[PDB]
Structure 1
Amino acid sequence: GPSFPEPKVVRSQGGLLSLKLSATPTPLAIAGQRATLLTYGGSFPGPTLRVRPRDTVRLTLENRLPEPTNLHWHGLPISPKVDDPFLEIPPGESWTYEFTVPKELAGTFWYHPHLHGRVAPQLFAGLLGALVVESSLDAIPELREAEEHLLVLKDLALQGGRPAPHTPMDWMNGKEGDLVLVNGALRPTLVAQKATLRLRLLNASNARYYRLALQDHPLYLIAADGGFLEEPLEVSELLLAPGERAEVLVRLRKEGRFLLQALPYDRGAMGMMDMGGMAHAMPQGPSRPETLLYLIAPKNPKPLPLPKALSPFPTLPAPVVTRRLVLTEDMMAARFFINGQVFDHRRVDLKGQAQTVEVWEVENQGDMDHPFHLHVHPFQVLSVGGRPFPYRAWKDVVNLKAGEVARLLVPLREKGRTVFHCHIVEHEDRGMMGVLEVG
């Protein structure tokens, strides 16, 4: 096959993407070993769905798991009566998700389970795939002529040919695995044929962070989670927290082999030590460095010029309310709170008005990083930690280090009940989620 493995793509046909996917235990070969994973469509990752604005998506999910499941269309600003976080599909039953792709939308999204209390084991076991909304901006020559690849960043641990079970410490920290994979492959080689690469990046891990750096090269950020930036932004590295997406241009500077690495990053995970008094919690410290892939540049690379502009970011109306959402932890209990409470699907926590804009100040009073996700209503990050964000783009996950406040501008779009939660999915399963009702 191609040197660089990527999920099989399913494209809409005549404006319609109509697909049946089964969620099923499936034996496959991964990373050189045989294992049984839980997959969509028989593969890990699941198939990439590729659509255009105004397409209809009709996706029938057949549940062939031994427990209930559902889908979250992560990042899509659609109705929460479709992207329904409270729906349960029982074992053996099916449900059809049908929606229209919004007109003003572009970027890399993804789909995965969202059945409260069971997300972390289901996502860890292999249930996820990407959704790409292609744009008329993809026709500008500086993007059209780039070589495009999707990179699904997802780690795994195997025991006895199956995904390793969650331990109590995994529920506290979020589970990370020793197999650090790209598109389900272990350290694949990308032999570039063009000097400019357009890489769509997805962190579909439960909890692992990827502090991305390409040896000898900057990255040019052109899209965040939910849409394009206004112009490319040069960065020396790019941190992708669980659930985040980014698109970058890589301008290969000379022939050679360059490693794409996940550099050391300390997200605040904890271990336990006994040194005579004790036992007491102790920081794990930064992750060990990982090589994600080997990038081989072509001969005599001459990259395209960067695009001067991408998409202007919308002018938003003045906001009508400011909200404050404080994140705290009880690590030894593995319980996680928003404003002092754990999720309860019967309780509405915030009530807002469709088509108004809100300012959300989300404050991490814990010691771990927490990547905060809001369904249905993409947001503009204004500042995090008191530092203004250096670009304007739609996001739907924002990472908070210990102590930091993020200030978000949140236009409320579709009416209905939806949720916001930490995207360390173990923390969501363990309570760090609340309910927003938009009317």
Structure 2
Amino acid sequence: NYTDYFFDEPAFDLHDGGYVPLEVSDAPEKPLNVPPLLKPDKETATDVYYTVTAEAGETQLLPGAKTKTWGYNTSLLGQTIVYRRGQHTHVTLKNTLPELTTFHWHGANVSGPYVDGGCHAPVYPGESKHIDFTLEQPATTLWLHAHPCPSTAEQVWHGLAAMVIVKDDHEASLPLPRNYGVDDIPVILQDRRFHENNQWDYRADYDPDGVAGPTAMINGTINPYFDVTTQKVRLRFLNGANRREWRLHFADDLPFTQIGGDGSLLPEPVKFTHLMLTCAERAEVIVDFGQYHEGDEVTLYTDDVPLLKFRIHAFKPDQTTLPDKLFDVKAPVVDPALPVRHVVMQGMDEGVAIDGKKFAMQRIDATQPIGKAQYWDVTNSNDAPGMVHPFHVHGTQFLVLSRNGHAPYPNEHGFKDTIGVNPGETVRLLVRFDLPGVYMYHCHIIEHEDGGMMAQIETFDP
């Protein structure tokens, strides 16, 4: 028998000796939390004005005491930020936390290293920073998380992540669910461990090879259920876990279509029974509950553990069907002057590194001209047991050309900013930076990021 998922079975997170299985919680089932859309300060056709505010607070997650949490414009996680292609965006960043944070727009194509908001973009307590940008990139699902170096892991654990939706005119024209909170919803998959008083303790739970709690947390909810009032729903999956891989699938083996990846819509829709997500990967999918009846409760699983209940209410019949081609993927041409960059991800545990060395934040590790496209060959040097390392790159949306010289997985024909690399595997990417600056590339298992599995590239203009 085969494995359903596209990644190499022997390298799944669950064969590790440190593996923490998910347990179903005792807490009562409650409605999936849907983060409200962040009301702009001002909006016109050309200019939008937002205030994003890191803040500390408390949240009812489990019965008893409220869990102390951080979040953007709310106690935990963050109100969902909407950006438009071609719109000039003005964001006031404001830190009201006790510690200093960063504001990373993961997958956004903005100048580094201040707008991109990496290690080099501190915002001290009490401080406000004012950034501005125009996105010239396809409609997709981004996110915002903290990125101090270190500790990105600790801060993300505390609850500093938020969904970011980018819109364009092409996506608006397709026949997709788009009614936010009703048939189009964030599904931000995370795992935590609660201690005494339902409180989190990252340092108590720390493991240099990835932190993973046994209690799953969807949009900062425990045992969520979502009431389905339409035949088709669109889930925007985001893996905001520190290490855990998600092996999503319905109990029924109900199919669903993927229409979106990290960076863009997929070129063509892809049908699925099971779907794996490494860290930071996103997938937009359409589910058809047409076969189910009022009162039926349908469960989404990961491995053998239930995640999310779907309650089926009365819904009017939906006759529409998706086009054969969703999106037109326009691949740059490789600059024949530039050679093939070979990035080598090596090690696990405390010995992670990239191309022989650990992050130094004064040090430029590589260079590349803007506007010009280069082949990257990203390799995972891990050995017999190994692990799938999610490779991420700031300030770009790349294309996947090969996996060990074969075709990329069916959901990889779009633009991506994060790709899972299996042990032994060498993937070929087509990477082009549009704006100059300094960008990191690192494994997005956030413990390895902080373990220094992270280099930075400086882009210039010739």
TM-score (norm 2): 0.84
1:420-439 equivalences in 2 (<5 Å): 420-439=441-460
Partner in structure 1 of residue 427 of structure 2 = 406
Count of aligned positions: 409
Alignment-mate amino acid for residue 145 of structure 2: H
Change (3 A) 1:357 1:133: same
SS at match of 1:239: strand
Alignment-mate amino acid for residue 26 of structure 1: G
1:37-436 equivalences in 2 (<5 Å): 37-80=69-112, 81-85=114-118, 86-102=120-136, 104-140=137-173, 142-144=175-177, 147-160=183-196, 161-167=198-204, 170-215=206-251, 216-255=253-292, 256-263=296-303, 289-299=304-314, 302=318, 304-319=320-335, 320-331=338-349, 334-366=350-382, 367-389=386-408, 390=410, 391-436=412-457
The 1-side partners of 2:161 and 2:227 are apart by 26
The 1-side partners of 2:277 and 2:227 are apart by 23
Q: CA deviation at 1:18?
A: 2.1
Unaligned runs of at least 5 residues, structure 2: 1-29
The 1-side partners of 2:448 and 2:131 are apart by 27
Partner in structure 2 of residue 36 of structure 1 = 68
SS at match of 1:315: coil
Give the fraction of aligned pairs with identical amino acids, expressed as a percent.
Answer: 30
Would the aligned equivalents of 2:389 and 2:445 in 1 still touch at CA under 8 Å? yes
Alignment-mate amino acid for residue 341 of structure 1: K
1:23-82 per-residue CA deviation (whole Å, 9 max, x = no partner) reads 222112124451111111123221100121122322222222232211110000111141
SS at match of 2:154: helix
SS at match of 2:448: helix
Q: CA deviation at 1:194?
A: 1.3
1:69-96 per-residue CA deviation (whole Å, 9 max, x = no partner) reads 1111000011114113212112222222
Alignment-mate amino acid for residue 149 of structure 2: H
The 2-side partners of 1:56 and 1:179 are apart by 40
1:368-403 per-residue CA deviation (whole Å, 9 max, x = no partner) reads 221110000110112234431235211001011222
Partner in structure 1 of residue 25 of structure 2 = none
The 1-side partners of 2:219 and 2:63 are apart by 14
1:144-172 per-residue CA deviation (whole Å, 9 max, x = no partner) reads 578211111122222244322235x7342
Change (3 A) 1:182 1:145: closer
Alignment-mate amino acid for residue 271 of structure 2: E
1:304-348 per-residue CA deviation (whole Å, 9 max, x = no partner) reads 3123221100131124321111111153xx131001100111211
Would the aligned equivalents of 1:201 and 1:246 in 2 still touch at CA under 8 Å? yes
Over aligned residue pairs, what C-alpha RMSD do you find? 2.1
Would the aligned equivalents of 2:32 and 2:218 in 1 still touch at CA under 8 Å? no
Change (3 A) 1:141 1:425: closer
Partner in structure 1 of residue 36 of structure 2 = 8
The 2-side partners of 1:203 and 1:124 are apart by 13
The 2-side partners of 1:214 and 1:418 are apart by 38
Change (3 A) 1:21 1:145: closer
Q: CA deviation at 1:303?
A: 5.4
Matched, 1:20 2:51: yes
1:130-149 per-residue CA deviation (whole Å, 9 max, x = no partner) reads 11012323433621578211
The 2-side partners of 1:93 and 1:154 are apart by 29
The 2-side partners of 1:298 and 1:307 are apart by 27
Change (3 A) 1:153 1:17: farther
SS at match of 1:258: strand
The 2-side partners of 1:340 and 1:118 are apart by 22
The 2-side partners of 1:209 and 1:298 are apart by 31
Would the aligned equivalents of 1:51 and 1:133 in 2 still touch at CA under 8 Å? yes
The 2-side partners of 1:162 and 1:259 are apart by 28
Higher normalized strand content (fraction of residues): 1
Would the aligned equivalents of 1:228 and 1:310 in 2 still touch at CA under 8 Å? yes
Alignment-mate amino acid for residue 388 of structure 1: A
The 2-side partners of 1:174 and 1:164 are apart by 14
Change (3 A) 1:133 1:32: farther
The 1-side partners of 2:403 and 2:207 are apart by 26
Unaligned runs of at least 5 residues, structure 1: 264-288
SS at match of 2:208: helix
